[PDB]
Amino acid sequence: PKLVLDLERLAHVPQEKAGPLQRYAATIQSQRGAYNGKVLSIRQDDLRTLAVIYDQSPSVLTEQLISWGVLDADAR
Amino acid sequence: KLVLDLERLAHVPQEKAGPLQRYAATIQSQRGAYNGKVLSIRQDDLRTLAVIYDQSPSVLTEQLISWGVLDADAR
Ligand SMILES: Nc1nc2c(ncn2[C@@H]2O[C@@H]3COP(=O)(O)O[C@H]4[C@@H](O)[C@H](n5cnc6c(=O)[nH]c(N)nc65)O[C@@H]4COP(=O)(O)O[C@H]3[C@H]2O)c(=O)[nH]1
Ligand SMILES: Nc1nc2c(ncn2[C@@H]2O[C@@H]3COP(=O)(O)O[C@H]4[C@@H](O)[C@H](n5cnc6c(=O)[nH]c(N)nc65)O[C@@H]4COP(=O)(O)O[C@H]3[C@H]2O)c(=O)[nH]1
Ligand SMILES: [Zn+2]
Numbered sequence: 001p002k003l004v005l006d007l008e009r010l011a012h013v014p015q016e017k018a019g020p021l022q023r024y025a026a027t028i029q030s031q032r033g034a035y036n037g038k039v040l041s042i043r044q045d046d047l048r049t050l051a052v053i054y055d056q057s058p059s060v061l062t063e064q065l066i067s068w069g070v071l072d073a074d075a076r
Numbered sequence: 077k078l079v080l081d082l083e084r085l086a087h088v089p090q091e092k093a094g095p096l097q098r099y100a101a102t103i104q105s106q107r108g109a110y111n112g113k114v115l116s117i118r119q120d121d122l123r124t125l126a127v128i129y130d131q132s133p134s135v136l137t138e139q140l141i142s143w144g145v146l147d148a149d150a151r
């Protein structure tokens with residue numbers, strides 16, 4: 001199970017619900033020195049942290065992220 | 077940057093290097109990247125390796141540099 005973000009989709013989700021996630025992906029892009037990408041693969045541990053950021057169980061944050069098309073179905 | 081020279085690592089006496097070798101090998105397994113000649117690893121892995129080796133992170137680092145496994149920019 002890789003955790004792949006589609007950042008093109010992510011840039012189309014409105015801000016005050018995608019904001020924390022968008023800032024999270026952006027920092028990961030930054031520290032890697034990779035701003036180029038279609039798509040961002042993130043750590044299993046990032047999902048956990050993001051859940052905390054978003055007041056959700058990893059399971060339902062995943063579900064939310066999958067409905068934006070930000071994560072793919074395979075993410076379960 | 078914690079970059080391991082795997083090729084130098086393979087030639088270090090296993091008394092010294094086996095644990096780090098197996099560590100590095102596992103990480104390669106997990107990336108499915110079995111063909112690199114260098115491996116950089118997480119900052120976090122240094123703490124774990126310290127425990128594995130029973131030394132300070134900073135001693136371990138000094139040790140790995142002297143084997144020529146780590147380059148000195150990691151000091
Ligand atoms: N302790 C340790 N474990 C390692 C290391 N390299 C790979 N792994 C482990 O093996 C899994 C697979 O890594 P991957 O194939 O590159 O799959 C990774 C990789 O594609 C990318 N990723 C995560 N962290 C980084 C990073 O710091 N830099 C880059 N360029 N990609 C990362 O996102 C993927 C998912 O990451 P994970 O959920 O963590 O799942 C990681 C991770 O648990 C390492 O250097 N140290
Ligand atoms: N293929 C692969 N390589 C790995 C992985 N984990 C660590 N590394 C490699 O080893 C470098 C050091 O990772 P770091 O200490 O965690 O230092 C990392 C880490 O602190 C952070 N970072 C990069 N990607 C991620 C990510 O996906 N999630 C999180 N939470 N932090 C990341 O930014 C720093 C810089 O990462 P890099 O520039 O890529 O530099 C990373 C990357 O080259 C992995 O799972 N797969
Ligand atoms: Zn657009």
Ligand SMILES: [Zn+2]
Pocket residue numbers: 014015016
């Ligand atoms: Zn608005």
